[PDB]
UniProtKB/Swiss-Prot annotation, chain B:
Region of interest: Required for binding alpha, beta and gamma catenins: 10-63
Source species, domain of life: Eukaryota
Name under which the protein is recorded: E-Cad/CTF3
Annotated positions of the Phosphoserine modification: 37
Swiss-Prot record, chain C:
Gene this protein is translated from: Ctnnb1
Protein name per the record: Catenin beta-1
Main location: cytoplasm
Modified residues (Phosphotyrosine): 9, 198, 200
Gene Ontology CC, one term: RNA polymerase II transcription regulator complex
Post-translational modification: Phosphorylated by NEK2. EGF stimulates tyrosine phosphorylation. Phosphorylation on Ser-58 and Ser-113 by CDK5. Phosphorylation by CDK2 regulates insulin internalization. Ubiquitinated by the SCF(BTRC) E3 ligase complex when phosphorylated by GSK3B, leading to its degradation. Ubiquitinated by a E3 ubiquitin ligase complex containing UBE2D1, SIAH1, CACYBP/SIP, SKP1, APC and TBL1X, leading to its subsequent proteasomal degradation. Ubiquitinated and degraded following interaction with SOX9. Ubiquitinated via 'Lys-11'- and 'Lys-29'-linked ubiquitin chains by UBR5, leading to its stabilization.
Amino acid sequence: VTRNDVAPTLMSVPQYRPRPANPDEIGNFIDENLKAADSDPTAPPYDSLLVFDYEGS
Amino acid sequence: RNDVAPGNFIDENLKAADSDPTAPPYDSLLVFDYEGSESDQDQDYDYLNEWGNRFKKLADMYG
Amino acid sequence: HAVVNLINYQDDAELATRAIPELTKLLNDEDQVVVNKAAVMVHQLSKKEASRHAIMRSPQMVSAIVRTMQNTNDVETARCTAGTLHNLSHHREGLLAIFKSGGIPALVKMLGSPVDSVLFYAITTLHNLLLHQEGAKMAVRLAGGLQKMVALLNKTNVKFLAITTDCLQILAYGNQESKLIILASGGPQALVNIMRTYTYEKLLWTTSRVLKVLSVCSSNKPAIVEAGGMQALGLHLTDPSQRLVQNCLWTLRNLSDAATKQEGMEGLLGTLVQLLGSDDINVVTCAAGILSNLTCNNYKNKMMVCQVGGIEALVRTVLRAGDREDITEPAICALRHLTSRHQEAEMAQNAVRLHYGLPVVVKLLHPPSHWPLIKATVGLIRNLALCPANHAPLREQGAIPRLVQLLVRAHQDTQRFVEGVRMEEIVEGCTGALHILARDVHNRIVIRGLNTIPLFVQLLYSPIENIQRVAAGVLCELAQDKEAAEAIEAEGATAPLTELLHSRNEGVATYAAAVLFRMSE
Amino acid sequence: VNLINYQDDAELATRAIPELTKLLNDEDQVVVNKAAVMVHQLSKKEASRHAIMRSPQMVSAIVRTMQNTNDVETARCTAGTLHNLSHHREGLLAIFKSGGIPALVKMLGSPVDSVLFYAITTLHNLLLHQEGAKMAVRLAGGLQKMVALLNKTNVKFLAITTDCLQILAYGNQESKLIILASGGPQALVNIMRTYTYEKLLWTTSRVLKVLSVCSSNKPAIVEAGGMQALGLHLTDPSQRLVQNCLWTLRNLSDAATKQEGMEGLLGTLVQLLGSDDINVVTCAAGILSNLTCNNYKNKMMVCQVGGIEALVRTVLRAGDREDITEPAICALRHLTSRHQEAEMAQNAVRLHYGLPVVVKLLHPPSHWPLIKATVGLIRNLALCPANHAPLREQGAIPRLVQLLVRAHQDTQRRTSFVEGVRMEEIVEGCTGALHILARDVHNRIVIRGLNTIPLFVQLLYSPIENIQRVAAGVLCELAQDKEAAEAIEAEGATAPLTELLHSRNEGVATYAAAVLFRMSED
C-alpha cells in the first residue's frame, strides 16, 4: 500500500543558542548556531515503512 | 430488550457528573419465550362353577 | 406351536365373542355382587389378546366396564375395571373404544382413588389416550384432570410421577388456560420440588419439560422462580443426560428475566460460564442468554461471573459466534453488564481487550449487524472506554468513524422503531459512547476531525433529557481544547446551553456549565 | 467373484445395519460397546461402508455413541468408523448432516491418541471437502482445541492439524483472533524452530503467513520470536518453504523494527538479494527496506555485511522493475543517514558504481513513489562531499530542479495526491536535495545558473514549515556568494526572510537570519 514516514527516535542533539546583544557578535552567533541546524537529525528525509499484506489464496 | 435502571467548583462537582451510578447506559433484560414442540396365560376360570347360577352359561364355556 | 397358537387364538377369540354379551348383561345387573363378579371375569379375559379384542370390538361391553368402574364402591372392582381399560388402552381400537364409552371422565375421577393400583392403571391409560386418541387432551382438560394430576405430584413412585408429569406436559403445551390451572393448583412448587428431590432420569426429564412449557407463561414464570426453580434446574446442568440438560437450559433461559433478584445463584452462574465452552452451539447460546439476563442490574452476580472467568468465555463466545446474532447479542449484552457498576468492572474492561475482544467488538458495529445488536455493541463500547487503556485500541479499530456514522443516520431519522430499536436510543447510544471516547486527546481530534460539532450542539435541541446530557458531555470534553471551544460557539452554543443550566438534571447542568465556561477563556 | 460378493456382503450388511443401530441405542453400556466394535470392523469392508454411509440413523447413532461413550475402545471404534466413512463424499455429507463435527471437535479433547488422530483427520477431510464444514467447526469451538493440539509431537499429526488451522484461518478474522488468543503464534513458532519434516514446516509457515496479515497477530508473532524462527529456513531446498517464510517475513517486517538479534536474518536477506528468483529478491528487498527503518543497529549491521553493494547490484539488475527498486532504493536511503556507518555507505554507493543508476531512476518511466525515494537517497548521498562532483556530472541538479518546478507548479494550479505521493513532498524533497547539494561551489553555480533563485524565494511564502526550511536553507548556501546574495536580495527575499525570523522552527529561523545577514554582509 502507501508508505508512512517515521520520526527519527533521536539520541538527543538539539542545541540553538539565543540571539545575544552586542551585535558585534551576532555574526558568529549564526556560524555556530548554523552548524547546528545543518546537524539537526530531526529534519527530513525520514525513514519510511511500507506495510505488506499478502495472504495468498 | 426492556431497559432496567439501578469558579473551579465546576471541575470538582464535575467528577461526580462523570462517575454517576444512576446514569446511562443501563443494563437490560431480554425476555425469552421458547416453548419447543398385562400378560396372563391363566385359563383357570373354574371359579365360575363355584359361583351363582347366573354364571352357569359362562362356567360352561370357560370351564 | 407355529400354528397351534394361531388355532387356539381364533378359538379363544370366537369363544370370547360368545362370552361378552353375557358378561355385559351381567355388568348391567342391579345386584352389585353379580357385577362385582362379572368385573372379575372381564378383567381376566382382558388379559389374553384374543379375549381382549372381543371386548374392544364391543361398545356395550366397554361402556359397561366404564360405568361400573366409576360408580362402584368396591376397591377390588375398581382395580379390575380400571385394569381392564388399562389393557384395552394398548390398542388403537381400544383407545377409541375407551374414548367413545365416556371413559375419560370416569378415569379422571379414578385419579382420586386412594388405591395405588387404580391410580397407576388410571394415569397410565389417560397417558395412552393423551398420546394417541384424538380429543383426549380436550376431554381430560374439560374433565378437570389437570387439577387431579397436579394433586398427585406429592406421590413418591418415580415411574408413576414420570407418567403423571408427562401428562401435564401434553395438556399444558401451548394452552394458556391449562397452564393457568396447573398454577392455580400449585403445580410450579410441586414440580420444582420433584426437580430437587429425585434422581430418576426419566422423571427429571419429563418434569423439566412441563417446567419448560410452564416457563413461557407470564404468570407461572414468577412462581417457578420463587419456588426455587433457577437453583433447582441449575442442579442438573452437568447431568450426563443431554436431553435433561438442554431442557433445563431452555427453562432456565425463559425464567432468567425474572430471576434478577434470586440468590444462591453461585452454583448456577459458575456452571453456565463453564457451559459456554460446550461444543454445542445451542448449549452456548442458552448459557449466553441466561448469563445476559442474570447479570442484569445485580452487582453480586456480575462479580461472580467475572471471578470464574466469564469475560474470556464470553469474548470467545462472540468470536465463535461470528455472524450469528442470536449468539452475539446476549453474549455482547453480558459483556456490557459485566463491564460496569461493580468492583471488578474496571478489570473487566481490561480483560475484554486482553483477550482480543476489541477487534471483533468494534467489527460488530458494521453490517450485516442489526440494530438490536448495534445498540448492544454500542453500549459495550462505551463501557470499554471507561478504561483509558482502551482509548487507543478502540480508535485504531475504527470505533469512532463508525460510531459517528451511525449517529448521523440515526439522527436524520429522529426528524422525518426500525428493526425493533427506536433511533432516539441509537443517538443517545453513539454520542454516549463518543462522550467517553472524547476523554482521549487523539480521539477529540478524530471526533471533531469528522465535523461533528454541527450535530452535537444541535443535539441540545432535543427534549430527551438524556440525549441532552451526553451532547453537553461531548462538548464539555471537546471544548477542553481551544481551537474547538470556539468552533462550538461558532454555531450557536451559549444560546441553548444557557437555558440547560437551569435543567433539573444534576448532570445536564454541571455539563452545560463547564461547557459555556471554558468556551470563553 | 469380486463383483459377486460385493452386492452380497453389501446387501447382507443392509440386513444387519438396522439391528446394529438399535444395539448402539441399547441402554446396556456393554451391548453398545460390542455393537460399536462390530460397526467399526464393518466400515473396513467397502461394501458395508456404503450401507452405513447410506443409513442416516446408523451414522447419527455412531456419532451419538462416540460423544457420549466412555469406552476408550468405543471411542476409538466410533471415531475410526467416522474416519473410514469420511473417505467418501456421502460419508462427509452424512457425518455432516448428523451433527458429527461438534462430536468430532469434542473428541479433539481426548487423551487417547488414536482417537485424536481419527478425529482431526475426519475433520480435516470435512474441511477440505464438505461444504459448510468450516463455519461448523468454528461454531463448535474447534480452533482452541486445535491450537492446543500443537502441543503434540507426531509430525504427521501436527501436519494435518496446522493445515486445519490454516484452512479455518484463511480470510477469517474471528478465527485468526481466536488462534492468537489461544497462543497460536508461540506454538507455531516453536514448531518452526524444532521439527524438520518439510510438509509440517511448510504448512506451519502457511498458517503464520495467514496470521501475519492480521494487525493483532503481527506483533504477537514478532514478539514470539517469529522473525528469527522464520529466518532459520531461508536456505532450505524447498522453494515453497522458503517463499512462504519470505512472504510472512515481509508482512511482519513493519512490526519488527524494534526487534533485537537480527544479524543472521539481516545477513541472509542481503545474500538473497542476489537470487535469480524475482519473488525472492523482491521480498528480500522489501524486508530489508522496513527492517532498516529507524533502527540504527540494523543499519550498521547491514552495511557491514555487504548490503550497500548488494542493494546497488539489485537496483542495477532490476531495471524498470519498480517492485524491486522502490524498497531497494528506500533501503539505500535508510542506510545513508542517521547512524555511525552512514558515511561509509554514502561512499560505498559510489565506490560500487551506483550513482549513475540512482540518478537515472529520477527519470521516466519511474513513478512518483520511486522518484520520491530516489530524491531522498540522492540527498543523503550528497552529505558526502566526495559525491558532489560525481553526482553533478550525472546531470542530477538540472533534473531535480525540473521535478521541483513542475511539482511546485502543480501545488499552485491546485489553488485556482498522485500515485499516493503528493507534489508538496516532491517540492520539499527536491529543494532539500538541492540544499545539501548546494554545498559544493561548482554546484552552487549550477543551481544558480538554472534560474532557481526566484522560485526558492517564492517557497519562503510556503505554509509548510519544512519547505520553508529547505527553501531558506538552499538560499543560505547560495547567499554565501556576493552576486548570489544580491540576486537573492533583489528577488525580494529580504521581506519574507525577516518574518521567518519569528518562526517557531529553530532551523528555519537560523537559515533566515543567516540570509538576511549574508545579504547585508558587505
